[PDB]
Each structure stands twice: as C-alpha cells, then as structure tokens.
Amino acid sequence: GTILIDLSPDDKEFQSVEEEMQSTVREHRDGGHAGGIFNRYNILKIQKVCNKKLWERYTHRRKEVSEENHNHANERMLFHGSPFVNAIIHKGFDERHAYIGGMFGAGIYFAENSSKSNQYVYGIGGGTGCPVHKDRSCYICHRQLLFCRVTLGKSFLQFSAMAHSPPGHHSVTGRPSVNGLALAEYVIYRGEQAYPEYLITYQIMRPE
Ligand SMILES: CC(C)c1ccc([C@@H]2NC(=O)c3cccnc3N2)cc1
Numbered sequence: 001g002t003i004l005i006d007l008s009p010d011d012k013e014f015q016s017v018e019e020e021m022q023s024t025v026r027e028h029r030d031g032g033h034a035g036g037i038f039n040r041y042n043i044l045k046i047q048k049v050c051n052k053k054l055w056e057r058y059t060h061r062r063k064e065v066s067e068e069n070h071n072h073a074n075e076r077m078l079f080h081g082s083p084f085v086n087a088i089i090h091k092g093f094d095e096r097h098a099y100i101g102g103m104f105g106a107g108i109y110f111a112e113n114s115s116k117s118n119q120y121v122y123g124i125g126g127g128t129g130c131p132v133h134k135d136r137s138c139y140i141c142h143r144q145l146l147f148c149r150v151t152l153g154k155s156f157l158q159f160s161a162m163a164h165s166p167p168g169h170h171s172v173t174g175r176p177s178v179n180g181l182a183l184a185e186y187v188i189y190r191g192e193q194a195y196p197e198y199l200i201t202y203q204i205m206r207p208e
C-alpha cells in the first residue's frame with residue numbers, strides 16, 4: 001500500500017527537510033567510527049511516504065495518547081536510521097525494529113541529531129559499513145534515513161551520561177547531561193506511535 005512521492009529541490013517542503021538534516025549534524029564521541037567522518041551531507045532525493053493504512057493507524061494511536069495527556073500528543077519530527085528502512089516504509093514500525101539492547105530498554109529509538117541516526121544506517125555501531133565496500137565512512141554508497149512523525153505523549157525524562165513504556169508514560173526522552181551539544185534521543189514502545197513520513201537518500205560528504 002505504500003507509494004513514494006519525489007519532492008522537487010525547488011519545493012519549500014524539500015528545503016525545510018534538507019535544513020533539518022544538515023543543521024542537526026554534530027560530532028560524535030567515537031570520532032566517526034560508526035557513521036563516518038563528515039560535517040554535512042549530499043542530499044540526493046527526498047520522498048514523501050504515503051500509506052493510508054499506516055497513517056490511520058498512527059492517527060488513531062495519536063488521539064488516544066493525546067486524550068491521556070491533557071490533549072497533547074507531544075508530536076515531534078525525528079530521525080530514524082536502520083538497516084530495515086525498506087521494511088518500515090512498506091509495513092510500518094513494529095517490534096522487529098526495536099533496539100533490544102538500547103540504553104533505555106527494548107524500544108524504537110529516534111534522534112534530534114541526524115548524524116546520530118546515521119550511525120545506525122548500516123546496523124548497530126555501523127555494522128560492517130556499506131554493503132559494497134565494507135566501509136562505515138563510505139563517501140560513495142547511497143544511504144537512507146527516515147524523518148518521522150513521532151508521538152511522545154507523556155515522556156519519561158531520563159538524564160543520561162519489545163519492553164513497555166514506564167508506567168504512566170508513553171515514551172522515554174534520553175537527554176544528554178554530559179555532552180551539552182548533543183540533542184535528545186527518544187524511545188517509543190509501540191510502532192503505532194511513529195509514521196515514517198520522509199525517506200531521505202543521501203551521501204555523507206568528505207570534509208574539505
Ligand atoms: C533494529 C536495530 C538494527 C536497530 C535499528 C535502529 C536503531 C536506532 N536508530 C536510530 O536512528 C537511533 C537514534 C537515536 C538513538 N539510537 C538509535 N538507534 C537501533 C537498532
């Protein structure tokens with residue numbers, strides 16, 4: 001049921017999404033081990049992901065959450081990188097897309113920082129890198145990220161140095177307490193609380 005619609009680079013929708021992508025690159029404590037060494041991306045394509053059934057599933061859940069949290073779904077747009085991006089855009093998020101050993105338990109992880117999601121495009125810790133060159137810092141192979149609509153509801157705040165939501169909460173907010181320049185990461189425990197709205201195809205760029 002999924003169809004992908006190409007946005008034109010001249011479209012302001014493309015531009016606002018590219019700007020979120022580029023502006024949220026940061027340095028990582030691994031020096032680029034997992035995701036590569038870059039300060040910016042070459043964006044190749046931005047597609048809108050259209051799936052009626054996955055959208056209605058998302059909105060039905062969003063309304064329930066909102067009703068449990070003073071009419072506030074606490075909806076964000078957040079990045080997600082995963083080797084399962086093609087399954088996600090066709091079938092939706094589910095338990096198979098959870099990070100079982102994640103620091104906030106077994107849920108689905110999202111990032112404010114695009115470069116943080118980029119670390120997971122080829123697997124946990126970057127896996128073995130790009131399929132073609134086995135290079136976690138490949139400047140040639142095309143990567144994909146999702147920019148997702150995510151319902152957080154009442155989010156448990158965990159300051160930081162498929163399972164269930166903590167009782168009374170709809171998600172977890174991992175807030176970096178040590179690196180004051182890292183943005184938050186978020187965990188949801190039901191796939192119905194995220195819709196994979198934009199599929200972004202890109203390359204990381206070698207610093208000049
Ligand atoms: C299911 C496995 C392979 C998996 C997929 C995706 C991630 C995940 N992707 C993110 O974009 C992300 C963002 C912030 C923190 N952790 C993340 N991991 C973790 C584990």
Ligand SMILES: [Zn+2]
Pocket residue numbers: 130131132133134135138139140141
């Ligand atoms: Zn490659």
